[PDB]
């Protein structure tokens, strides 16, 4: 018996600015796999899947230029809960409904995906610095439907 599954990926891009730090070329164009989940196991508004880790790696940082770094995220927001990213599918596949994608900083704080809600400021050390995040699905309806649940977002660095 086939199973109904919801899952997909989120793709992140950012500007390559030679500011206080330089963003790794790997981090500035990356795809994070969120997993596949049994659709029937989403049974209530607010159900969430496991947090999937991803990183933004900064190279060649100079704390003398800027003591701290933070990140904001921008994408098309879910209409039911605008603190989540709306999900989409490829043309050959159906889109899941009743879920959005949540991004959290390393303090476990969700970030509104409006391009102006920045993560907790992190102290920089000379050279390479790792900024850690997670992503997951969050149900926006009690009854969800199966399919692909992908998103595209941009990230924005703030050095202070």
Q: Are strands 52-61 and 99-105 parallel, antiparallel or unpaired?
A: unpaired
Q: Where are the domains of the chain?
A: 1-160
b/e per residue, 121-137, with b = 16+ CB within 10 A? ebebeeeebebebbbbb
Contact between 63 and 156 under an 8 Å Cβ cutoff? The reply is no
Q: Which residue has the tokens 């500007």?
A: 15
Partners of residue 7 on adjacent β-strands: 36, 148
Contact between 102 and 10 under an 8 Å Cβ cutoff? The reply is no
Work out the widest C-alpha separation in the chain, in whole angstroms: 61
DSSP 111-139: --SBS--PPPPEE--SEEEEEEEEEEEEE
Give the closest residue to 104 by CA, choosing from 84, 125, 80, 82. 84
Contact between 136 and 105 under an 8 Å Cβ cutoff? The reply is no
Count of residues making up the chain: 160
Give the closest residue to 122 by CA, choosing from 55, 159, 69. 69
Query: Rounded to an integer, what distance in angstroms lies between the CA atom of residue 139 and that of residue 109?
Result: 17
How many CA atoms are closer than 13 Å to the CA of 132, on its beta-carbon side? 6
């Amino acid at each position: 018996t086939p199973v109904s599954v919801s899952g997909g990926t989120i793709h992140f891009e950012g500007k390559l600015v030679n500011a206080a730090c330089a963003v790794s070329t790997k981090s500035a164009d990356q795809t994070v796999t969120l997993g596949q989940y049994r659709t029937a196991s989403f049974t209530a508004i607010g159900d969430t899947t496991a947090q999937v880790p991803f990183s933004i790696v900064l190279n060649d940082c100079d704390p003398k230029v800027a003591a701290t770094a933070a990140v904001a995220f921008s994408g098309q927001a879910d209409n039911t809960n605008t603190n989540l990213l709306a999900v989409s599918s490829a043309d050959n596949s159906t889109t899941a409904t009743g879920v959005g994608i949540e991004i959290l900083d390393n303090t476990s704080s969700p970030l509104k995906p409006d391009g102006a809600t920045f993560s907790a400021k992190q102290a920089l050390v000379e050279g390479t610095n790792t900024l850690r995040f997670t992503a997951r699905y969050k149900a926006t309806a009690a009854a969800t439907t199966p399919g692909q649940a992908n998103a595209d977002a941009t990230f924005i660095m703030k050095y202070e």
